[PDB]
């Protein structure tokens, strides 16, 4: 399985539009790096070599440090209700690590664009890339900023002189469905 690409791409996607790569040797990822967080939920992390499934998916994005605890079955917040929602019947296993030395430029890195406004909570495993203007009040704004109408994207201001919990943390979310073994 070409895990060397989903973990090592030179540019990771953003939260509101996460890249989903499907797969048609986990001892390379388990033994490799610090990996600030590594929790597997449905399957025990050690026996990942005797139970196999039809196909695996590896989503990816870049979220803030103190929001990693939101990528879990049954969570709420600006990330788990509007951008990426994991179903309560999860079976895969989440991983995340720090990337402060790559995705942070002195002067601000304005390419990561988590969304913070939406009319309803996202459903499990949905994606919304629309960029319409959010209508807060009762008077329509016809697609222009102003009063009670906002732009629903709020790009992160990444910098190297931040504190842990505000530095970029890449994420990969392996999810299994039942082949590859």
């Amino acid at each position: 399985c070409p895990f060397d690409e989903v973990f090592n791409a030179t540019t990771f996607a953003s939260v509101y539009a996460w890249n989903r790569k499907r797969i048609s040797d986990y001892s390379v990822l388990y033994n490799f790096a610090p990996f600030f967080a590594f929790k597997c939920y449905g399957v025990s992390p050690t026996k990942l070599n005797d139970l196999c499934f039809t196909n695996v998916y590896a989503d990816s994005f870049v979220i803030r440090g103190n929001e990693v605890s939101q990528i879990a079955p049954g969570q709420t917040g600006n990330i788990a209700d509007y951008n990426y929602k994991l179903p309560d019947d999860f079976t895969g296993c989440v991983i995340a690590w720090n990337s402060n030395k790559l995705d942070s430029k002195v002067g601000g890195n304005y390419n990561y664009r988590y969304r913070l406004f939406r009319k309803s909570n996202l459903k499990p495993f949905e994606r919304d890339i629309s960029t319409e203007i959010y209508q807060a009040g009762n008077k329509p704004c016809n697609g222009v900023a102003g009063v009670n109408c906002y732009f629903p994207l709020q790009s992160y201001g990444f910098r190297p002189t931040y504190g842990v919990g505000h530095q970029p943390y890449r994420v990969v979310v392996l999810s299994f469905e039942l082949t590859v073994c």
Partner: protein
């Protein structure tokens, strides 16, 4: 779709953009303060102006939501903190006039020059030389010349400006439904709509006047003692039943009596504890000091330093050419970035200032989870109280003898105890009457009870009646004596220095009982106790989210500020003074004056 739900929608976007812009501004300001060049000044001014413009635009935008239909308390607090017009409610000409006279007053105070009568090309500014003559000189005539000339050649330029500043600020304050500029100042201590913790803007006056009514018995004895000691350095100039001339107090204004220690020391043959030789003996540097401070802080139950604090902070003076304003301060750039800027030497004063600054850093680390507009102390008198209890409890002999700076046995006696207590009293108690009197004068001036032809008369009447000092030369109604003080000409409040001194000892006595102390209060040490840390953290993490009268109860057990802990702290000195003035006359008469002869 209701008027309440849109407030949260607006507040989210405001929070995010404000965090970003504030971080940029603070980073620019830091990069200027640590490395002075010419282009750093403009690079800082740009970000500052951008942040101010964003703030003004959001303020004029926020006026759409009426504060009457809001039901949440946090949303209402944030809106009311954002909706306030402040200045710019005036016209344009008046605003320009106000800014011009403010800058003119600040400039006049900063670069005022006085010079000799017999050698007129020897002019001295204030900071390098006047408050040094007034601090170290022991000559009566020289101190009198300095004290008179500073008020005759600088204070006389500030009166026609103050007379206009008063009216302009009164108009600006009446434009916001406040009835004067003094109520605008006292509005910080106000609390509304909590059903059990209310606090009007007019009850602060009564609370201050009732807490000052119980410090008089101690200030009278301290005054009598200092007078009986000053009748020996300047004989035939002080009267045994009169006040003290205002130029023999230690500095230009008489705010701190701490420079009178060399004259009025109780036992002059016992040196107070000063561990500076041992630090150079064990070769302590600028980093071991902060390591020890952090260890003391984590001992009580507070977190470590954020590990971003060690690489970015400036704990030593940069050598070759990095001209840097190192006045010890703690920065809160935001987004989890805390830094400290100070020029640390190897002494004891820096060993205590490190604790004082790390207190502010810990407070800032506490409430960093609140919204952007709610990241501050409960009011203007909590931050410094929290930062001061640390240096209070970190300079005891019992704490110093466990770090290693004192000999292992070092038996303590009561003479050094009285020495230390008296050196503390000349700074803590010697300023409460002055602060109370000055703020009372300013409140009465702004309110409109002291007409502008009775300013100096009432000022000196109150200084004779409350503080207990008399002027050496009659001052008619052309002078303006208060305007020659930094906080009066630069438009800063002054009631925080009074409530801080009470909150400090309230917190200290509240924490001394969780650590289960036994002896007197001035020997307290809160280290190695996880109850004091828990009680303090139950208040540090609130910020401005709760009314201060509730954040105070979560520590001490009462709602209003009290004065009993201060007297309980100063009890031994009080008894000793009460037994040293058997023959002297405790009190003063407001009729004797040094010129009526």
């Amino acid at each position: 779709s209701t008027i309440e739900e849109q407030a949260k929608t607006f507040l989210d976007k405001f929070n995010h953009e404000a965090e970003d812009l504030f971080y940029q501004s603070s980073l620019a300001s830091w990069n200027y303060n640590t490395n002075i060049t010419e282009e750093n000044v403009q690079n800082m001014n740009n970000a500052g102006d951008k942040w101010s413009a964003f703030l003004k635009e959001q303020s004029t935008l926020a006026q759409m939501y009426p504060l009457q239909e809001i039901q949440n308390l946090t949303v209402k607090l944030q809106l009311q903190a954002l909706q306030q017009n402040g200045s710019s409610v005036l016209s344009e000409d008046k605003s320009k006039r106000l800014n011009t006279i403010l800058n003119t007053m600040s400039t006049i105070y900063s670069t005022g020059k006085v010079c000799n009568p017999d050698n007129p090309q020897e002019c001295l500014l204030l900071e390098p030389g006047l408050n040094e003559i007034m601090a170290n000189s022991l000559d009566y005539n020289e101190r009198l010349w300095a004290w008179e000339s500073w008020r005759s050649e600088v204070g006389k330029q500030l009166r026609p400006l103050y007379e206009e500043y008063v009216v302009l600020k009164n108009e600006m304050a009446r434009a916001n439904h406040y009835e004067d500029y003094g109520d605008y100042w006292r509005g910080d201590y106000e609390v509304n709509g909590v059903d059990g913790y209310d606090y009007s803007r007019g009850q602060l006056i009564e609370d201050v006047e009732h807490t000052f009514e119980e410090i008089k018995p101690l200030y009278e004895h301290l005054h009598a003692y200092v007078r009986a000691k000053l009748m020996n350095a300047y004989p035939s100039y002080i009267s045994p039943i009169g006040c003290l001339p205002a130029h023999l107090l230690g500095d230009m204004w008489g705010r701190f009596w701490t420079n009178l220690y060399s004259l009025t020391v109780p036992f002059g043959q016992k040196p107070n504890i000063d561990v500076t030789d041992a630090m150079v003996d064990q070769a302590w540097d600028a980093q071991r000091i902060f390591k020890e401070a952090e260890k003391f802080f984590v001992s009580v139950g507070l977190p470590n330093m954020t590990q971003g604090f060690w690489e970015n902070s400036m704990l030593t003076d940069p050598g070759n050419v990095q001209k840097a304003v190192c006045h010890p301060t703690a920065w809160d750039l935001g987004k989890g970035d805390f830094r400290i800027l100070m020029c640390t030497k190897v002494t004891m004063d820096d060993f205590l200032t490190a604790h004082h600054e790390m207190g502010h850093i810990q407070y800032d680390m506490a409430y960093a989870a609140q919204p952007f507009l709610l990241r501050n102390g409960a009011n203007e008198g909590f931050h410094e109280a929290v930062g001061e209890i640390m240096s209070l409890s970190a300079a005891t002999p019992k704490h110093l003898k466990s770090i290693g700076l004192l000999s292992p046995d070092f038996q303590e006696d009561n003479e050094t105890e009285i020495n230390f207590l008296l050196k503390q009293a000349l700074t803590i108690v010697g300023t409460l009457p002055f602060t109370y009197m000055l703020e009372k004068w300013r409140w009465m001036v702004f309110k409109g009870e002291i007409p502008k032809d009775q300013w100096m008369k009432k000022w000196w009447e109150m200084k004779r009646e409350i503080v207990g000092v008399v002027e050496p030369v009659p001052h008619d109604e052309t002078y303006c004596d208060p305007a020659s003080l930094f906080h009066v000409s630069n438009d800063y409040s002054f009631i925080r220095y009074y409530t801080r001194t009470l909150y400090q000892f309230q917190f200290q006595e509240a924490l001394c009982q969780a650590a289960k102390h036994e002896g007197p209060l001035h020997k307290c040490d809160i280290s190695n106790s996880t109850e004091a840390g828990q009680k303090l953290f139950n208040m540090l993490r609130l910020g401005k989210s709760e009314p201060w009268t509730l954040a105070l109860e979560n520590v001490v057990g009462a709602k209003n500020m009290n004065v009993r802990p201060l007297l309980n702290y100063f009890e031994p000195l009080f008894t000793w003074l009460k037994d040293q003035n058997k023959n002297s006359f405790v009190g003063w008469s407001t009729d004797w004056s040094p010129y009526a002869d």
